[PDB]
Design an enzyme around this catalytic site. Structure first.
Site, mmCIF file in Angstrom:
data_model
loop_
_atom_site.group_PDB
_atom_site.id
_atom_site.type_symbol
_atom_site.label_atom_id
_atom_site.label_comp_id
_atom_site.label_asym_id
_atom_site.label_seq_id
_atom_site.Cartn_x
_atom_site.Cartn_y
_atom_site.Cartn_z
ATOM 1 N N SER A 46 -1.030 -7.696 -5.057
ATOM 2 C CA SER A 46 -2.242 -6.892 -5.071
ATOM 3 C C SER A 46 -2.636 -6.484 -6.482
ATOM 4 C CB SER A 46 -2.073 -5.637 -4.191
ATOM 5 O OG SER A 46 -1.908 -5.946 -2.803
ATOM 6 N N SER A 94 -5.727 -1.433 -1.364
ATOM 7 C CA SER A 94 -5.321 -2.834 -1.512
ATOM 8 C C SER A 94 -5.847 -3.682 -0.355
ATOM 9 C CB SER A 94 -3.798 -2.947 -1.617
ATOM 10 O OG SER A 94 -3.289 -2.302 -2.772
ATOM 11 N N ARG A 222 8.522 2.749 -7.055
ATOM 12 C CA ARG A 222 7.709 2.135 -8.103
ATOM 13 C C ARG A 222 7.161 3.192 -9.056
ATOM 14 N NH1 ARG A 222 3.571 -1.253 -4.434
ATOM 15 N NH2 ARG A 222 3.497 0.869 -3.578
HETATM 16 C C1 LIG Z 1 -0.512 -6.243 -2.387
HETATM 17 O O1 LIG Z 1 0.385 -6.039 -3.134
HETATM 18 C C2 LIG Z 1 -0.438 -5.963 -0.908
HETATM 19 C C3 LIG Z 1 -0.643 -4.467 -0.580
HETATM 20 N N1 LIG Z 1 -0.299 -3.686 -1.751
HETATM 21 C C4 LIG Z 1 0.434 -2.569 -1.472
HETATM 22 C C5 LIG Z 1 0.935 -1.604 -2.438
HETATM 23 O O2 LIG Z 1 1.575 -1.992 -3.476
HETATM 24 O O3 LIG Z 1 0.693 -0.421 -2.255
HETATM 25 C C6 LIG Z 1 0.724 -2.543 -0.120
HETATM 26 S S1 LIG Z 1 1.636 -1.363 0.759
HETATM 27 C C7 LIG Z 1 0.372 -0.706 1.897
HETATM 28 C C8 LIG Z 1 -0.829 -0.052 1.193
HETATM 29 N N2 LIG Z 1 -0.458 1.334 1.022
HETATM 30 C C9 LIG Z 1 0.296 1.705 2.228
HETATM 31 C C10 LIG Z 1 1.297 2.838 1.967
HETATM 32 O O4 LIG Z 1 1.300 3.806 2.706
HETATM 33 N N3 LIG Z 1 2.156 2.750 0.927
HETATM 34 C C11 LIG Z 1 1.929 2.230 -0.422
HETATM 35 C C12 LIG Z 1 3.511 3.247 1.151
HETATM 36 C C13 LIG Z 1 0.989 0.420 2.730
HETATM 37 C C14 LIG Z 1 0.160 -3.777 0.546
HETATM 38 C C15 LIG Z 1 1.237 -4.647 1.189
HETATM 39 C C16 LIG Z 1 -1.425 -6.867 -0.167
HETATM 40 C C17 LIG Z 1 -1.140 -8.336 -0.387
HETATM 41 O O5 LIG Z 1 -1.362 -6.570 1.229
HETATM 42 CL CL LIG Z 2 -5.165 -8.030 -2.943
#
Ligand SMILES: *C(=O)[C@@H]([C@@H]1NC(C(=O)O)=C(S[C@@H]2CN[C@H](C(=O)N(C)C)C2)[C@@H]1C)[C@@H](C)O
Ligand SMILES: [Cl-]
Ligand SMILES: *C(=O)[C@@H]([C@@H]1NC(C(=O)O)=C(S[C@@H]2CN[C@H](C(=O)N(C)C)C2)[C@@H]1C)[C@@H](C)O
Ligand SMILES: [Cl-]
Ligand SMILES: [Cl-]
Ligand SMILES: [Zn+2]
Ligand SMILES: [Zn+2]
Ligand SMILES: [Zn+2]
Ligand SMILES: [Zn+2]
Lengths: 237, 237
Positions: A46, A94, A222
Site C-alpha cells: 500500500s 488504503s 510499525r
Molecule cells: C497495503 O499495504 C494493504 C493495506 N494496508 C494496510 C496498512 O498498512 O495499514 C492494511 S491493514 C488494514 C487497514 N487498516 C486496518 C487497521 O485497523 N489496521 C492498520 C490495524 C486494517 C491493508 C492490508 C492493501 C494491499 O490492502
Molecule cells: Cl494500495
C-alpha cells in the site's frame, strides 16, 4: 550511511525483526540498524499509494483531494473500503479498489514511463496493471523509498508541483506542536511498511521501516518501533 | 444560526467570557453560545497572518513555504522572533517582523484591493501599512472569520489555488487518526483569537472563537475551551 546495531533492541524487545532507516536532511546523513535489510527490496504493497496518486493527479485521473470516487457496489472484506472515498480517505484506509481504478485509467504505458521518471525502485510493473504493486514484480528497498520521498518533499519529482503538494497533504498522519509526520503504511501478509518523514522547525528526518509481520496483531509495532527510535535519537520528544 | 447558551458553561467554568462559533459544512448550519458577540468585530491581530500570507504568496513576495526570511538583526522581546523563519514557522510563532515586511512589500494599494476581493471583515487598512492589523482600523467578527475561512478551504478566494494550498499547509496545527486542525491564534493584550477548521473523514467543521484575555496566563484557554466544545458536540473524541 552509519549502522547503529543498538537499534536492534527496539525490534527484539517486541520479539520482532526488521529495519528502520533514518535520513537527516540538513546533514545529508543516514542511520539504520541493518544496512543490508535497509537495501532489501520488497513489494511496496500500500506504500505504492504515493506514486500512484501522484501519477493519477498529474494525468487528470483525479481532479483534487475532494473529488469523490464512488464505491462500485462490490462488497469487499475490509469494511472501510465499501463506501465512497476521496484521495485523503483512500490513503488513510488504503482503499485498494480506488488505486486499482487509478492504475487502470493510467494504463501500463504511462505507469511504466512514470515510475522510470520517478526512479522508483526496480521500475518493473510486470503483472496485472491494477495489482502489480500487490502481487507483481515491482520491488523497492527502504533506502530507495527514502530516495523517492526526498524528491517528493522537495517537489523535484517529474510531475507538477501541484500534484506533489496534494499527495503530501494526503500523506498527513500526525501533527502537534513539536513535529509533523507525513507517511504511508503497508502490509502484504508477510512484511509491514511505514515510510515518510518527520517535519521539524528547522529540519526534516526521512524514514523508511519494514518488519516481518506474521499476523495483523502487531501492525501497530510499525509506528511504535519507529517512534521509539525517533525518541531515542531525540528527533521527537 | 442557532444559539446554544448552555455552551456558556465552558467559559464560566474557567472564569472567562467569550464566544465560540461553529459551522457544519455539510449541513450549512452554524452554532454559537452568543449570537451577538459572534458578530462583534475585533482587531484580527495575528489571525491576519492568513490573508497576509495569501497575498504575499500570490504577489511573489514569498516564493514558497521553504523560503527563508532572514532575521533583520533587531532583537525583539519575543525570543522566537529573533531568528530566521519560513512561512511555516512564521505562522507557528506569529513572527510579526516577517508579516510587517510582507505588508510593506505588498503595499497599501494592493493590500486594500486584496482585502476587498477577499470580502475580509470591514476591509479597512487605515493606519500604518505594516501595523494596521495590530493597531489600525481593520476589524473582523467571528462569523466573518468563518466566511473567509470557508472560501480558503474551498480554494475560492481571489488568489491562485497554489497560494491557498500553501497557506493551508502553514495553518496546520494538530492531526491524528480522528481529525485535522488547521487554525491560527491571536492575542492583542485584550482579546484572544482561535480561528480555523476541523477536518473529518466526511465533513469539515469551521470554528472561530474569541475571549477576553486580561493576562497571558490563560492563552491556552483559547484551544482548551474550543476543544471542550468540540468534544461536547461529539465533533472530536
Ligand atoms: C497495503 O499495504 C494493504 C493495506 N494496508 C494496510 C496498512 O498498512 O495499514 C492494511 S491493514 C488494514 C487497514 N487498516 C486496518 C487497521 O485497523 N489496521 C492498520 C490495524 C486494517 C491493508 C492490508 C492493501 C494491499 O490492502
Ligand atoms: Cl494500495
Ligand atoms: C498576534 O496575535 C500576536 C502574537 N500571537 C500570539 C498567539 O495568539 O499565540 C502571541 S502569544 C506569543 C506567541 N506564542 C507564545 C506562547 O508561548 N504562547 C502562545 C503562550 C507567546 C503573540 C502576542 C502578535 C501581534 O504579536
Ligand atoms: Cl498539508
Ligand atoms: Cl502577525
Ligand atoms: Zn518498545
Ligand atoms: Zn517530461
Ligand atoms: Zn473546561
Ligand atoms: Zn482578478
Amino acid at each position: 550511511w552509519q549502522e547503529n546495531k543498538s537499534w536492534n533492541a527496539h525490534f527484539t524487545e517486541h520479539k520482532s525483526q526488521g529495519v528502520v532507516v533514518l535520513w537527516n536532511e540538513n546533514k545529508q546523513q543516514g542511520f539504520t540498524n541493518n544496512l543490508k535489510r535497509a537495501n532489501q527490496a520488497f513489494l511496496p504493497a500500500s506504500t505504492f499509494a504515493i506514486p500512484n496518486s501522484l501519477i493519477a493527479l498529474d494525468l487528470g485521473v483525479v481532479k483534487d483531494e475532494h473529488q469523490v470516487f464512488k464505491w462500485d457496489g462490490q462488497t469487499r472484506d475490509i469494511a472501510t473500503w465499501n463506501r465512497d472515498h476521496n484521495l485523503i480517505t483512500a490513503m488513510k484506509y488504503s482503499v485498494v479498489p480506488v488505486y486499482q481504478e487509478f492504475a487502470r485509467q493510467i494504463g501500463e504505458a504511462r505507469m511504466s514511463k512514470m515510475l522510470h521518471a520517478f526512479d522508483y525502485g526496480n521500475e518493473d510493473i510486470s503483472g496485472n496493471v491494477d495489482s502489480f504493486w500487490l502481487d507483481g514484480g515491482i520491488r523497492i528497498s527502504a533506502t530507495e523509498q527514502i530516495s523517492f520521498l526526498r524528491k517528493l518533499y522537495h517537489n523535484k519529482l517529474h510531475v507538477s508541483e501541484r500534484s506533489q503538494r496534494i499527495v503530501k497533504q494526503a500523506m498527513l498522519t500526525e501533527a502537534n506542536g513539536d513535529y509533523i509526520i507525513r507517511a504511508k503504511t503497508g502490509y502484504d501478509t508477510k512484511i509491514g511498511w511505514w515510510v515518510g518523514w518527520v517535519e521539524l522547525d528547522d529540519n526534516v528526518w526521512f524514514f523508511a521501516m519494514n518488519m516481518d509481520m506474521p499476523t495483523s496483531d502487531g501492525l501497530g509495532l510499525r509506528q511504535a518501533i519507529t517512534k521509539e527510535v525517533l525518541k531515542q535519537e531525540k528527533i521527537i520528544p
